[PDB]
Amino acid sequence: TYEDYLPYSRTELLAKIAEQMSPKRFKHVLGVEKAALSLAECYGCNPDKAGLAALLHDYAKECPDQVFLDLIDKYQLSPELAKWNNNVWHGMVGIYKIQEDLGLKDKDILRAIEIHTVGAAEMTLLDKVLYVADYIEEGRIFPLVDDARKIAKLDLNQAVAYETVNTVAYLASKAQPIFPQTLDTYNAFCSYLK
Amino acid sequence: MTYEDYLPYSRTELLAKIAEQMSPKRFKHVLGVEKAALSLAECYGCNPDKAGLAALLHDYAKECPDQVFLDLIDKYQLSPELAKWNNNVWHGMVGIYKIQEDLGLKDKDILRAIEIHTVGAAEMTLLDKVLYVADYIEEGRIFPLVDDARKIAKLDLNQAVAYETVNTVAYLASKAQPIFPQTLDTYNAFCSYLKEYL
Ligand SMILES: Nc1ncnc2c1ncn2[C@@H]1O[C@H](COP(=O)(O)OP(=O)(O)O)[C@@H](O)[C@H]1O
Ligand SMILES: Nc1ncnc2c1ncn2[C@@H]1O[C@H](COP(=O)(O)OP(=O)(O)O)[C@@H](O)[C@H]1O
Ligand SMILES: [Mg+2]
Ligand SMILES: [Mg+2]
Ligand SMILES: [Mg+2]
Ligand SMILES: [Mg+2]
After folding, report:
1. A51: CA distance to ligand 3 center in Å?
2. In this protein, which residues make up the domain named HD/PDEase (chain B) (predicted)?
């Protein structure tokens, strides 16, 4: 339960989150919540924080590009962010929409949501829990997910490495631009996958 | 074609000096890069004397031990972040100072092409791009991606640079090897030419 961080009960918070997104997307979010709570109890991070980070991580996934461009300007974010896309924005910039809409103040939860797509070179246990739960949640079936599910309850750092390497390989396979912080993560975790 | 405007060597004197730096297999790779760079230069209009010499010298420091590059980094007070990397990054990015000390090369354009022949840059001249693709598509290189790279290189040089940089990043990912940040600079600057290709 999440009342230490937000003035919402569960039924109201899930209703508010559900107002932001498609049913396929909201079902993904509940899967990430289940996956993050089970990773939190395995690795010992606070499940109240893990579960809430999971419920909110894709809160801004469906906002149009202008919402993120306006937040970049309003909160004086690095102007270089404006050259990117929703993949980068919905976490890195969407945390400002989460704070405005919901009043979330917890730095640890906000940071985990902020980097849940691109990672960082230095990630806390909470950051890694969400980063892996988002990938391995039960509704995601893609062939590369299944080894990540196995790695994740043995060694969390190797689960992060596996995701970041497969992401850089996927982006390269489509010739899509790789955000520089995604490289920070890749180089920081490359050795755990070796 | 001949390079005495830039170095105090004739061809036989220069090729003897280069062959002293490296294995015979590596020297055969270098002669091939010279052939491909000359064949890229008259087509796209860069100076073949500048292109051929950059190709002859690009792997001059390939076989130097790590301490040669660490000593050069300190001596020329290059970025300390370079010391965390490896020969793959150093032999062009730092090896240009060994070329300058050993051979007296001062041509800024040739030196810059050698400097980034492995990792690229976000901004590349025509000469830089010629060397970068010539090194990849050279006649002795046989790996599965060579043939499409050779095909692209005669239509669109920017799409050939894009093809090499994007495929280099995918290879490094397949081995979990660390990617130098300037390689990403190249990748992100050229990724759009490979989308249009694809
Ligand atoms: N560093 C990066 N640069 C560009 N695109 C990226 C980068 N990292 C991840 N992506 C892409 O972002 C997309 C969204 O990812 P993510 O937030 O992890 O999950 P979801 O869509 O569940 O929100 C994926 O399609 C992924 O390939
Ligand atoms: N960013 C990078 N990080 C680590 N290795 C790299 C990077 N970019 C290229 N390499 C590697 O450097 C090696 C030597 O490359 P290169 O200099 O282009 O060949 P040559 O040595 O014939 O001129 C290749 O194995 C390539 O995969
Ligand atoms: Mg997301
Ligand atoms: Mg998600
Ligand atoms: Mg080389
Ligand atoms: Mg070479």
Report:
1. 15
2. 22-149
Chain B: residue nearest A83 by CA? B188
- The number of residues in chain B equals 198
Instruction: Tally A–B CB contacts below 8 A.
Output: 51
What dihedral angle (degrees, nearest 10) is formed by the CA atoms of A111, A112, A115, A120?
Answer: 90
**Domain enclosing residue A90, as ranges:** 10-141
Q: Per this entry, what is the length of chain A?
A: 194
Q: Is the Cα dihedral A128, A131, A134, A136 positive or negative?
A: negative
B170–A173: do the CB atoms touch at under 8 Å?
A: yes
A168 falls within a domain: no
Structural contact between residues B188 and B122, judged by C-beta atoms closer than 8 angstroms: yes
Can you give the resolution of this entry in Å? 1.9
Using CA atoms, how far residue B91 sits from B5, B57, B115, B185, in Å, is 24, 11, 8, 19
Amino acid of residue B77: Q
Question: Which structure tokens are listed for B42?
Answer: 């008259």
In a domain, A186, yes or no: no
Technique behind the model: X-ray
**Burial of residue A35 (number of CB atoms within 10 Å: 0-12, 13-18, 19+):** buried
Mutate to test the pocket of ligand 1, among A22, A33, A87, A131 (most ligand atoms within 8 A of CB): A87
CATH code of the domain containing A17:
1.10.3210.10
